[PDB]
Amino acid sequence: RRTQEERSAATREALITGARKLWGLRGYAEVGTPEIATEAGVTRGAMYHQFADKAALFRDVVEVVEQDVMARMATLVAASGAATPADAIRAAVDAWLEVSGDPEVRQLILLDAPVVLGWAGFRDVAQRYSLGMTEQLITEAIRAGQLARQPVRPLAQVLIGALDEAAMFIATADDPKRARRETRQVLRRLIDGMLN
Amino acid sequence: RTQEERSAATREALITGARKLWGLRGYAEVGTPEIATEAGVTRGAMYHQFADKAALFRDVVEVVEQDVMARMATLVAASGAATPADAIRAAVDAWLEVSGDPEVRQLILLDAPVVLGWAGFRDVAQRYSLGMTEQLITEAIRAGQLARQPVRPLAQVLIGALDEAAMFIATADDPKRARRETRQVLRRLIDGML
């Protein structure tokens, strides 16, 4: 026997896992909640006990994917050997271009999320984690004397705007391999210009 | 009067009314009946000019983009900028002024990427503000004022930064200080870029 809180937690995770998989492959518009409930092996009644509607489930999917994106990026940044805050910023660019190239991340984060959530929803749900990490890297680069002292939150929001748009440019390009290479170069120059 | 004069006046009334109402309340909050009513057009005539709500939005974005391009060009010329690099610098101030218009933010920044999709909006902006940015970047490179690099990605990434800068100011608890701080970080980023 499982306790009710245990069954509720296992039900919730199965739905997030199933929605993430199916929406990742086919897009938010192409998969309904009945097919997701079936995929998770849960009844529709249990599903609607965890999530009021389709959009509430998508929001949780986005949160979980974004957390995964950050963890994957931290691994790539650690693998780059970056040993200063500025070098971590440079590596975070390449890490983002690699992870956002994941077809599931492309579908869920780049194509679906800005449309399903709107601007304010995407900032609050999707962007908040990356914005916080970016603010920290900026603060540390200023502390280390690698970046001129300046307002941290506006600069972080501007960088995130540039990085999100870079991923969109690659994701929609008729030659994504080429677009990724060109975009990587302009982003590296933009970061190097931002720094000392 | 002439038949095309009628359709053109009908088309222009629908775009003007849709621009105004969607500008004030957002695409999702105004239906085509309220727009036809604002424009003084019948439900049949409005349908004859625009197949669906999104088709009308596409023409609204075109004229708004045109207005943004013209306002940006006017302010940059008015700033006294006389080199491509100074024109790029002046565009920061010009955009922060033009983007203080809530209709511009609602239609271009909030609605357009949702209603048209990102690539669908790009197809419109490439003929207007995006194309203009690409040209200014090309000229700064030709002048040796900007490091040679892929023009199309740089133009689009810079616009992405400017889009979010405008939204950061608009939602700030203190918008007046946010505009000053955001101008500073944008100027520093551009000056480092040049």
TrEMBL record, chain A:
Keywords: DNA-binding, Transcription, Transcription regulation. GO terms for cellular component: plasma membrane. GO terms for molecular function: DNA-binding transcription factor activity; transcription cis-regulatory region binding. Residues 9-69 form the HTH tetR-type domain. It comes from the Bacteria. Residues 32-51 bind DNA. GO terms for biological process: regulation of DNA-templated transcription. This is Probable transcriptional regulatory protein. It comes from Mycobacterium tuberculosis (strain ATCC 25618 / H37Rv).
